[PDB]
Amino acid sequence: DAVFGDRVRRFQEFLDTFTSYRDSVRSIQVYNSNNAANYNDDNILPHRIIISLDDLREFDRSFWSGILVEPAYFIPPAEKALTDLADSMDDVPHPNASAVSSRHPWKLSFKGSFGAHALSPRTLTAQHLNKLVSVEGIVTKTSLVRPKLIRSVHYAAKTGRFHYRDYTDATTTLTTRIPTPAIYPTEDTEGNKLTTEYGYSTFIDHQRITVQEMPEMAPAGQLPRSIDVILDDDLVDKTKPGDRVNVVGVFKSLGAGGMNQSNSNTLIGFKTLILGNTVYPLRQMLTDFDIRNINKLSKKKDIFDILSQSLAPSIYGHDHIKKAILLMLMGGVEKNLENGSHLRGDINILMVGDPSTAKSQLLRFVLNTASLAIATTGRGSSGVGLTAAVTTDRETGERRLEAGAMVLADRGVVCIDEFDKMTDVDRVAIHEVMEQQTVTIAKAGIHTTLNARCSVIAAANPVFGQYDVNRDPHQNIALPDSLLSRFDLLFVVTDDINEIRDRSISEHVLRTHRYLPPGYLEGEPVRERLNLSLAVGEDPKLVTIPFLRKYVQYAKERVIPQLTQEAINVIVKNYTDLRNDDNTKKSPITARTLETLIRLATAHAKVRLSKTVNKVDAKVAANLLRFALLGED
């Protein structure tokens, strides 16, 4: 009534006080308008802006406090004012055939500092209901996208006029209203037959996601907790399972909560939900300074050595394995070939070695430094847990598929630990993914082929406790030959007792164990708790890790080298020399070694930020594979 109009006036004043929002409205409007005029087209921007809570805090403390504390009485007044401003801006007429019926009202999004309203799915209780909150977590489950009716239009014969009926739901609006039965009117007020006219009605896409707490922040002895978020309109399909997200929305109650005709019970409570306003991913955009630095650092001669050594500075030695990991990070170029085939561009590495040889501390580093990485353990995994699982969608009722570890890491890496301890029934599935890079599901009436293009790095142990040099290589490794053929580089690492090596490595380890984080006193235990302050503002030389991430991203997305003849000449001579020799290698040499040389050469070419494969790339690939197969170093 009066309060609604007063708040509309307040927000209207706020809008012309700061001119940025008015300019963004015009930019979106002109973009959408002149896009439709391009008949010879080469797509549509949604009606949603992002305002900062901070600026509103200086403008009007009362309105900011109302939005943060009582959103359900201050957001709808703001949306009407934004719609009015947007309607005022659009001077050009749009006599469209059916856009007159559906207005697509403008909505709002928020950013800035939330103070005490930044929480997690665990610290959210009944004290935060009907409040604007932001929750950080990991997406686990998503529902199928369905259309929902918002307004129905009917045509009346013998009169020629139209009649519309509006529908509302608890999840649709922020205010509780009288419910609607969602049944189309059939009789006019005068009794004339009504015909439903699809194409003038309004439907909106609806989705439900589940956000779980980060497992690293959970208390001792407790399992992580999860919450449900509802997305609508233009927020649909902006998240996938496994993603790390931050969702800003209104925490809301729903239902009757067992205080009704049903029997009295202590086990019945209310249901809680979040109507998300905004979603933020917790792709690093690069400026011209960063790109210029990358191009300047590319021209240095010893760039490969620096890049490889920058990996895991807390590991002493293992230079060649660290080079192989870097070559994994910058994968090869995939070739699509006739007969529906593709040559894989991924590099797969296996490490077999003695106990306590820093095999498992490199997989953990790859988990952190890479863009996408999935961790797996041999004994705690199953075949149905790696490829896909048949489940049900509670909200709609169909039967669907849920992704597994391999398919969730498409265009990523999978790090498997204790690979030899995996059961045989489990080990067949990974075989297919390593060969075809596709999963075939033919269960419960769901016949589908799923794409899985991932790089595999694995660590295992020999049959006995330690590697034996007096026995043949195949006796030492329990893995079958078919599985072993699918790895590009097999590294056998051994711990040998030598006084100088021990003196150096012990010094390095003792130096590492004496590190104090900044801002901590001696003897002060590390407080890895953050004190519930999740965030302050809601949205020889070595190189730093973020710079390496930028370098890897830029190389993967900007250069695609092509093979040359003079590199092929080196590759063929290396292959012919390696094949025809009496040296006893730890792995047999076959016709698939040539493809490994090609892939390593392509990766080294990408490292140099060049569009051609040179002779030096072939030499580096040859040296790496000679070290891997022979140990001639």
Binding site: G112, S113, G115, A116, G519, N531, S533, V536, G537
Partner: protein, 173 residues
């Protein structure tokens, strides 16, 4: 200006960003690079007992002081939004002393209007937690006293001790 104050001595040893405005040889142990001389337009973090003086002597001084990370716009916005809930200990253990120091070197009226309000709003919670003497017959206190600056702990201890002595004398039988 307390020569013998321990806390002032500690707070005066913090590291601030700065940039060399000249080119000079002979240095380098500032960068932990002994033989290498320092170049022009080099950004290093120097302690406050050195950067304060190096920015005065030259005219243009030898070194320029760069805006600190603890006085960014994010920290000011967080202070303004919710003063009590903010964890000043994580930002810096000596926030207030460095705040008055920064106001003194560079006259900033905006910072003097924000720090005063922050202190005034946190004093109420400090008094509330200091006045709560337990009776023999909470999580809030433990949570709050872990967010206190080095200066505020002294005030908390003084107020708590005074309250306990007053209560002890009142109920001595």
């Amino acid at each position: 200006m307390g020569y013998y104050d321990i806390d002032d001595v500690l707070a005066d040893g913090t590291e601030f960003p700065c940039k060399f405005q000249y080119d000079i040889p002979g240095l380098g142990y500032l960068e932990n690079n002994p033989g290498r001389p320092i170049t022009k337009n080099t950004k290093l973090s120097l302690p406050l007992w050195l950067a304060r003086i190096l920015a005065i002597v030259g005219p243009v001084p030898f070194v320029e002081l760069l805006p600190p990370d603890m006085f960014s716009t994010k920290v000011m916005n967080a202070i303004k939004t919710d003063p009590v809930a903010l964890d000043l200990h994580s930002i810096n253990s000596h926030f207030f002393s460095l705040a008055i120091k920064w106001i003194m070197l560079f006259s900033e009226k905006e910072l003097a209007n924000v720090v005063s309000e922050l202190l005034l709003q946190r004093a109420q919670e400090l008094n509330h937690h200091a006045s709560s003497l337990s009776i023999d017959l909470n999580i809030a206190t433990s949570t709050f006293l872990l967010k206190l600056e080095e200066m505020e702990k002294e005030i908390y201890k003084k107020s708590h001790e005074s309250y306990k002595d007053t209560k002890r004398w009142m109920f001595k039988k």
